[PDB]
Amino acid sequence: AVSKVYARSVYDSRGNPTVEVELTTEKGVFRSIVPSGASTGVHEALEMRDGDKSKWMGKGVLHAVKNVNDVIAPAFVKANIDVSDQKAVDDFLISLDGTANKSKLGANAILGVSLAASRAAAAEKNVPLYKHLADLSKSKTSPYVLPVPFLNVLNGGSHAGGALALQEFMIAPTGAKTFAEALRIGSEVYHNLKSLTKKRYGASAGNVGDEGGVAPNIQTAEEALDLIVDAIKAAGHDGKVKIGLDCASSEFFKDGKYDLDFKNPNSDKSKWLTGPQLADLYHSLMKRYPIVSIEDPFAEDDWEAWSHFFKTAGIQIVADDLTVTNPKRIATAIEKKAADALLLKVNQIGTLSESIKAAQDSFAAGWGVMVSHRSGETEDTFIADLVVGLRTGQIKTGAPARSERLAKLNQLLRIEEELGDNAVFAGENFHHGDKL
Amino acid sequence: AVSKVYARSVYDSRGNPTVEVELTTEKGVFRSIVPSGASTGVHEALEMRDGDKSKWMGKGVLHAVKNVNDVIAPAFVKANIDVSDQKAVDDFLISLDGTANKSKLGANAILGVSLAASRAAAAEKNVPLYKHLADLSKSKTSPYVLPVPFLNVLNGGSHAGGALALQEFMIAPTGAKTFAEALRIGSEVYHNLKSLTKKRYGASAGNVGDEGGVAPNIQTAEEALDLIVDAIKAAGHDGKVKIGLDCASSEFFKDGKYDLDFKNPNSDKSKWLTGPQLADLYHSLMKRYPIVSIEDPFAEDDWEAWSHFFKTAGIQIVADDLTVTNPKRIATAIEKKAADALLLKVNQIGTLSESIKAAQDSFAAGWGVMVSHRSGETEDTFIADLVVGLRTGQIKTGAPARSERLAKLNQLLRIEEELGDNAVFAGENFHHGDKL
Ligand SMILES: [F-]
Ligand SMILES: [F-]
Ligand SMILES: [Mg+2]
Ligand SMILES: [Mg+2]
Numbered sequence: 066a067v068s069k070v071y072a073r074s075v076y077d078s079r080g081n082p083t084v085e086v087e088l089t090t091e092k093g094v095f096r097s098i099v100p101s102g103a104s105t106g107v108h109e110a111l112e113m114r115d116g117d118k119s120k121w122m123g124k125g126v127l128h129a130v131k132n133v134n135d136v137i138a139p140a141f142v143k144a145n146i147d148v149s150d151q152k153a154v155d156d157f158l159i160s161l162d163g164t165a166n167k168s169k170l171g172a173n174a175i176l177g178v179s180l181a182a183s184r185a186a187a188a189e190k191n192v193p194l195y196k197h198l199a200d201l202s203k204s205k206t207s208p209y210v211l212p213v214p215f216l217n218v219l220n221g222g223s224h225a226g227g228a229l230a231l232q233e234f235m236i237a238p239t240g241a242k243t244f245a246e247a248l249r250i251g252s253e254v255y256h257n258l259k260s261l262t263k264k265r266y267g268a269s270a271g272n273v274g275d276e277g278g279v280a281p282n283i284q285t286a287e288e289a290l291d292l293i294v295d296a297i298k299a300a301g302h303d304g305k306v307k308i309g310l311d312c313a314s315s316e317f318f319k320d321g322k323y324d325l326d327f328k329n330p331n332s333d334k335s336k337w338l339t340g341p342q343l344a345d346l347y348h349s350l351m352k353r354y355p356i357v358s359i360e361d362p363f364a365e366d367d368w369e370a371w372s373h374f375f376k377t378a379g380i381q382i383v384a385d386d387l388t389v390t391n392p393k394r395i396a397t398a399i400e401k402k403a404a405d406a407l408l409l410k411v412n413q414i415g416t417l418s419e420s421i422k423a424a425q426d427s428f429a430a431g432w433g434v435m436v437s438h439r440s441g442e443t444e445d446t447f448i449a450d451l452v453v454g455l456r457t458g459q460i461k462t463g464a465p466a467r468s469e470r471l472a473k474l475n476q477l478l479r480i481e482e483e484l485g486d487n488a489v490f491a492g493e494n495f496h497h498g499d500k501l
Numbered sequence: 502a503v504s505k506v507y508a509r510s511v512y513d514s515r516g517n518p519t520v521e522v523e524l525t526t527e528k529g530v531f532r533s534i535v536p537s538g539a540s541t542g543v544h545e546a547l548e549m550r551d552g553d554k555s556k557w558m559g560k561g562v563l564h565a566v567k568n569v570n571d572v573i574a575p576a577f578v579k580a581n582i583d584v585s586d587q588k589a590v591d592d593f594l595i596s597l598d599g600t601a602n603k604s605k606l607g608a609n610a611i612l613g614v615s616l617a618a619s620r621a622a623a624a625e626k627n628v629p630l631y632k633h634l635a636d637l638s639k640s641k642t643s644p645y646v647l648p649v650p651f652l653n654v655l656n657g658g659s660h661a662g663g664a665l666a667l668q669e670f671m672i673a674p675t676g677a678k679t680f681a682e683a684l685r686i687g688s689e690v691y692h693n694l695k696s697l698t699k700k701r702y703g704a705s706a707g708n709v710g711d712e713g714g715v716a717p718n719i720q721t722a723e724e725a726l727d728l729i730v731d732a733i734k735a736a737g738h739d740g741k742v743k744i745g746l747d748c749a750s751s752e753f754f755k756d757g758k759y760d761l762d763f764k765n766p767n768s769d770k771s772k773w774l775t776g777p778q779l780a781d782l783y784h785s786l787m788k789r790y791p792i793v794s795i796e797d798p799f800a801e802d803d804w805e806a807w808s809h810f811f812k813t814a815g816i817q818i819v820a821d822d823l824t825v826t827n828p829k830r831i832a833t834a835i836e837k838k839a840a841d842a843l844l845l846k847v848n849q850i851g852t853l854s855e856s857i858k859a860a861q862d863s864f865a866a867g868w869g870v871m872v873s874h875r876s877g878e879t880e881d882t883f884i885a886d887l888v889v890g891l892r893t894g895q896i897k898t899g900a901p902a903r904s905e906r907l908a909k910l911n912q913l914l915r916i917e918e919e920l921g922d923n924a925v926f927a928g929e930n931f932h933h934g935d936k937l
Contacts, residue, residue, distance in 0.1 A: 073918060075911040080688045080713075080901035085911075098911075119737075121685060122692050226704030249557060252516045256558050268662030272708030272716045277516075277903075280708045301555075444880050444908040465516035467713075468905030472880040475511040475521075475534075482509060 066091055067148060067185070070141050070178060072133035074126055077101050077441040078469035079275065081124045086133060086177035090148065092188040097180035097447060099173050100412045102439035104223040104232065106315055106365045106386030108394060110415040113171030132174035137161055141178065148186040151201050155179055155418035172415035179417040180447055194447075195480060198454020202421045205456060208489040210498045211244035211481050212458040213237050214474060215309045215358065215435065216251045216465060218258050218296075219281065219289050220274030222313045224440055227282045230325045233311030234278075234289050235461070236297070237357065240305025243490055244481040248474055250302050252465045257296035265292075275440040277466030284326075286346075290354050297355075309358035310350075311461075314343075315386045318364035340370030344377075351380065357495075358435075358459075360408060361385045371403030381406045381496055383435060390414040390423050399430040406433045406496070408461065411448070424455050433496040435459035442469035449476035458491025458498020502527055503584060503621070506577050506614060508569035510562055513537050513877040514905035515711065517560045522569060522613035526584065528624040533616035533883060535609050536848045538875035540659040540668065542751055542801045542822030544830060546851040549607030568610035573597055577614065584622040587637050591615055591854035608851035615853040616883055630883075631916060634890020638857045641892060644925040646934045647680035647917050648894040649673050650910060651745045651794065651871065652687045652901060654694050654732075655717065655725050656710030658749045660876055663718045666761045669747030670714075670725050671897070672733070673793065676741025679926055680917040684910055686738050688901045693732035701728075711876040713902030720762075722782075726790050733791075745794035746786075747897075750779075751822045754800035776806030780813075787816065793931075794871075794895075796844060797821045807839030817842045817932055819871060826850040826859050835866040842869045842932070844897065847884070860891050869932040871895035878905035885912035894927025894934020 068089050075085045075098060088095045101112060113132075115125035140161060146153050158178055162169040187197040199206050215235040217224075222232025236254050241247030262279045263271035270281040283289045290308065297306050317327035322337030338346065340363060347362060358381040363370035365386035375382055383406035388394045390413035398404050407427040411420050424434050434457040436448050442463070449472075452460040460477075463470035481488055491498035504525050511521045511534060524531045537548060549568075551561035576597060582589050594614055598605040623633040635642050651671040653660075658668025672690050677683030698715045699707035706717040719725045726744065733742050753763035758773030774782065776799060783798060794817040799806035801822035811818055819842035824830045826849035834840050843863040847856050860870050870893040872884050878899070885908075888896040896913075899906035917924055927934035 073914065075914055076684070076688065076901055076907045078902070078904045078907065080691055080907075082688075121688060226699050226707035228704070248512070252512065252518075252557060255516055263662050267718075268664070269705060269708070269716065269718050271662035272705070272710060274708060280705065282703075282705050442904065444904045444911070465512055466514070467903045468514045468878065468880045468908065469903070471512045471514065471516075472904065475880070478509065478511055 066145065067142055070133065070138040072130045072177065074130050077443055078467065079441045081441060082121050082126050083443060084126055084129050084133070084173045084177050086181045088178065088181035088185050090185045090189065092185065095181045095184035095188060097177055097184065098443035098445040099177050100439040100443065101441035102410065102412065103441060104313055104316070106389050108389040108391060109413045110167040110172035112173045112412065126173060129171045129173045132170040133177065137170065137174065137178060148182045149190065151183060151186070152418050154182045155416040158416060167415045172412060176412050176415050180411070183417050194450035195453040198451050201417070202424065202455055204454065204499065208487055209453050209484055210456050210458045210491045210501060211477060211488055212452050212460045212491050212498060213239040213247060213495045214251065214477070215459060215461045216255065217276045217278045217461070217463050218255055219292060220276055220278030221280065221283070221289065222316060224276055225274030225278065225280035227280045228326070228328060229283050229289060230317055230327060231286050231310060232313030232316070234293055235309035235311065236293060237307040237309050237495070238302070238305060239307050239493055239495055240302070241490065242492070244477050247490065248465065248478065250305060253300045254296050254302060254306055255465050257299040258293065261292060261295050261299065273464070273466055276463035277470050278464050286350060290350065294354070307355050307357045309360070310356065311360040311385070312362050313385070314361050314363050315365040318367065340367060340373065344370070344374050357381060358383060358406070361387065368401055368403055372401050375402055375404060381433060383408050390420060392419070392422055392426050395423060395426050399432070405431065406435060409434050409436050410439065411451070412439065421455070424457070428499050433457060433459060433498065435461050437461040438463060438470070438473065444469060444472050446472050446476040449473045449480070453480055456499045458501065459495045502581065503578055506569065506574040508566045508613065510566050513879055514903065515877045517877060518557050518562050519879060520562055520565050520569070520609045520613050522617045524614065524617035524621050526621045526625065528621065531617045531620035531624060533613055533620065534879035534881040535613050536875040536879065537877035538846065538848065539877060540749055540752070542825050544825040544827060545849045546603040546608035548609045548848065562609060565607045565609045568606040569613065573606065573610065573614060584618045585626065587619060587622070588854050590618045591852040594852060603851045608848060612848050612851050616847070619853050630886035631889040634887050637853070638860065638891055640890065640935065644923055645889050645920055646892050646894045646927045646937060647913060647924055648888050648896045648927050648934060649675040649683060649931045650687065650913070651895060651897045652691065653712045653714045653897070653899050654691055655728060656712055656714030657716065657719070657725065658752060660712055661710030661714065661716035663716045664762070664764060665719050665725060666753055666763060667722050667746060668749030668752070670729055671745035671747065672729060673743040673745050673931070674738070674741060675743050675929055675931055676738070677926065678928070680913050683926065684901065684914065686741060689736045690732050690738060690742055691901050693735040694729065697728060697731050697735065709900070709902055712899035713906050714900050722786060726786065730790070743791050743793045745796070746792065747796040747821070748798050749821070750797050750799050751801040754803065776803060776809065780806070780810050793817060794819060794842070797823065804837055804839055808837050811838055811840060817869060819844050826856060828855070828858055828862050831859060831862050835868070841867065842871060845870050845872050846875065847887070848875065857891070860893070864935050869893060869895060869934065871897050873897040874899060874906070874909065880905060880908050882908050882912040885909045885916070889916055892935045894937065895931045
């Protein structure tokens, strides 16, 4: 029995405030802190800021805290809802809000009672969260699939100050044979990288980005892709490590052309490329590099470039800004075949239930699902248990640097070690981990 | 009753492995992850690496894990030691090691059973850790003193790739009237800073350092001090925020002269300054800036420059590398009056007990005590409770960025909120917080 829903403000990996919700049942205090991304696409549920320029650069969340303390809080103690009933929690919460983009109470306000309540059911069925999440989503359990961590080693978009356009160059130790091994390879590739970067580029090029990546002032893709290769060789893990891209293309989408130097700035549109020309750029890149995943190649609504691109892909296409963890918009991408992967962001939709629902819909259509963090993360380790919970096999939780990142990976070590023989690493089957 | 001491390897804020110890009593599993610094002075207890170039760049800690699992582990279940008995735990642990710099079992191996056992006593006396720590150290309790967080906003030493020599430029919101307020000011000064830096210096100068600080390629001190001022004005908190320095002078200590460009490199010794000349440098700096704390002005053994400097100080002098959290060496600094502040690093000495002892000895001599983190931190939030526990009033836990930092600050918000009227912020009495 839920006795007291409370919320307080706390800090996120980037120093901005966010919402922490403490749920108290007869079994203890369950907590959950809320992520915050900042690159984001249009169709994402709404995170409500204070807008008060005089406090926390007006990014405060004083209100959203209030939505929880004086509004949601009381309704709930009293609604005497059964926390095992994720759907019933979410549902009360959606209705409370009565809006479609959680703009009434603000998604930051809700996500939080959601997650928190999932931990309180866990404590109650007396099982680890991963198992809870396993139940909620009706996912196999024999083995659990520890995922290939897609580690963002060099950052170049909203994520870091530098001239680099594509936003994320991720390494994937899919060749590894256990989670602890993959994590060991990546750290290695990672460390090698810090060095080739501080060498070719300058002591300063070794400074990180928002997701703990290196932020060399590279310009073109090739230059950074070549940089990852070199450290992949340096490290001695050649063939065991694959690359992944996050073009975050919504961002240099203009006048119907994509600007690779959305910062030149006397950028020659004589250069701005059309959908089909970027289509060739990427093929060029794809044949020359151990590239297996490409996230948001085209902008959040350029459906034509996706479907076209997608048909001759031969690799995993991930929808971030195109589908914003919305069944609504997923439906469109399936129908239109804009892709085959769903980057899942809990805070993009606001409730546990709608997200689990985002994943089912994706799985029934043959898509894979990479569970993600945000540029602005907290010490909360929930994605760790949800990635295992959903049995997808791919998680984007950043570089092996900056602890709002490691807290997730360190959590994954603990699950693996815990499960024993009852867990298998997706490995080369990252893509179809669910039903593996 | 202690039933099973286990250890596993996990990752630190910088991606290197470290030791995680799980202690299990009849009340649950207590955990603790071990910090790791990397700048460090000579006289620090020993952190034992694997030395195996082929795994984790040979920074693995496969052994140290083994010291705990097959050696310390068994002795302990059986020694049936009363975890309320910190001293008895530590003591068994020291003796097990039989060495003076914990070089036999490695300090990373021990710290860990120590901390972990302190959390298991807490769970057992049925009180929050801060209160436990309060007991262990016989410290007042009516009010508790939340400390002024010394936030490292611009980094320039081992901590970050750039030309800057002094290692840390810290802001201190000592004017604030509560912990949550100080934390709010600093975030503000901080954010303002990210901007003046990306402006004057370049998108790249906005990338952080090891402690989440900004790493502009500044050269001189003045330039960076002026940069903090500007954001202090920008932010609108003028007079409410003080500056703190970490010269980390052991590092550019050479031929008996200090090299401000320990990277020039055709550095003119015609420039290398003697103890008394740096003495003037700092006065220059001190009269021109809201400087209240200076950590390691002189190298770890240049006792003469400390005592000399110290006499005309008029401000707080902090011993990091000079005293390496060692009563032994503190004794020397008191006698010799090399200072009046003790940067306390639990991992520098290896046991909870010797650290608490480091603090008493410091307090009895009139010194203050700033509790510190390390360049390589974890999601563990123990320093948070020890800073409150010892009632010192000053903590160095990094910038409001990168969650291995925020996990401590976010923890401090929770204590304040928790204690109610039973807590007071050291404020302007940072220095003598203990007996306030
Ligand atoms: F993303
Ligand atoms: F330090
Ligand atoms: Mg993305
Ligand atoms: Mg220091």
